[PDB]
Amino acid sequence: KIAFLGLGNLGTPIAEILLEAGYELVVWNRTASKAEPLTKLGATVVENAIDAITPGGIVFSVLADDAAVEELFSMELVEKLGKDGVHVSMSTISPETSRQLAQVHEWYGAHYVGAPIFARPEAVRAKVGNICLSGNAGAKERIKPIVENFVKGVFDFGDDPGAANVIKLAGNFMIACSLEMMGEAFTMAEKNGISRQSIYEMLTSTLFAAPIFQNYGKLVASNTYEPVAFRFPLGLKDINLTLQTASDVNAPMPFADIIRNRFISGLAKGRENLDWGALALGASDDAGLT
């Protein structure tokens, strides 16, 4: 019944909840072995993504980037999805990529729903994550009861298929700013003979007592960016999507320029295998603490 394309760190747990909730899934992944835990839960697997699509049915996708979504959602695949078909596109991609693809879906009477997820894999299993939806109202109304199974909050951002994507980029931009201001602040404290952990504990106990600052603050305090939750080069990819998006509506983003340079400089320093949180090491570099 429901096609599910892309079974990475988020696709796997998302698909497991939809199977547990009684939905029939036909799944696919570029790496075929990732789908076998879902076959035990009732799902069916196919060798080619187009074999998973039902004319007028629902297809979910969760892929790494803009090129992965465009490569998969070819004209011939979208045409099979066809009239009244609905694509719930959960990848973190550009508003422009979403609006372009949404346009192609409407050629065949199908609907593209921009559905970026605000959840790390643990938050999905715990169903404490959130989703933003944008696109056709009838199509959002059809899939809203499905996505309620793996998130707490569902936020609607209207008709524009790329609007929810703007919110996701803005959210990730604010996370990156939080990392940077803590790097700066904790380095200033450190060079003043104050432990990074003590300033972190005080400030996030009170003023900055939100999950982003407590989870990311511990990384910045210890300045240990291993194990990896999101690979370092992927932070650069995301801030560049934000900068492109803002530039296209003539909006400067001075903080985002600084974040971008932290990633570029970090790659010059051989930090490609660290977590994206390691952008916060730039403040340590500049203050001579390498």
Which residues here bind Na ion, judged by CB under 5 A? 148
Task: Tell whether residue 207 is a contact of its own copies (CB under 8 A).
Answer: yes
Which token pair is 199? 């300033």
Distance of CA 137 to the CA centre of its chain: 23
**Residue of minimal CB distance from Na ion?**
148
Q: Is 85 helix (H, G, I), strand (E, B) or coil?
A: coil
- Residue 106 CB, shortest distance to its own copies, in Å, is 18
Contact yes or no for 240/255 (Cβ under 8 A): no
- Which sign, positive or negative, has the C-alpha torsion 254, 233, 153, 104? positive
CA pair distance 14, 91, nearest whole angstrom:
13
Catalytic residue among 1, 83, 144, 168: 168
CA pair distance 183, 259, nearest whole angstrom:
11
Q: Which is nearer to its own copies, 20 or 122 (CB)?
A: 122
Residue 213 contact among Na ion, its own copies, none, beta carbon within 5 to 8 Å by kind: its own copies
Task: Tell whether residue 221 is a contact of its own copies (CB under 8 A).
Answer: no
- Residue 178 CB, shortest distance to its own copies, in Å, is 8
26-55 binders of its own copies (CB under 8 A): none
CA pair distance 139, 156, nearest whole angstrom:
12
Q: Which is nearer to its own copies, 106 or 160 (CB)?
A: 160
Instruction: Name beta bridge partners: 61.
Output: 5, 89
Residue 148 contact among Na ion, its own copies, none, beta carbon within 5 to 8 Å by kind: Na ion
Contact yes or no for 239/267 (Cβ under 8 A): no
CA pair distance 59, 110, nearest whole angstrom:
11
Catalytic residue status for 168: yes
Going residue by residue from 88 to 117, which x/- string records binding to its own copies, judged by CB under 8 A? -------x----------------------
Residue 145 contact among its own copies, Na ion, none, beta carbon within 5 to 8 Å by kind: none
Number of residues that bind its own copies (CB under 8 A): 64
Q: Give Cβ neighbours of residue 71 (< 8 Å, ≥ 6 apart).
A: none
Residues 204-243 as b/e (b if ≥16 CB within 10 A, e otherwise) read beeebeeeebeebbebbbebebeeeeeebeebbebbebbb
Residues with a known catalytic role: 168
Positions that interact with its own copies (CB under 8 A)? 95, 118, 130, 132, 153, 155, 157-158, 160, 162-163, 166-167, 169-171, 173-175, 177-178, 180-182, 184-189, 191-194, 198-199, 201-203, 205-213, 242, 245-246, 249-256, 258, 283, 286-288
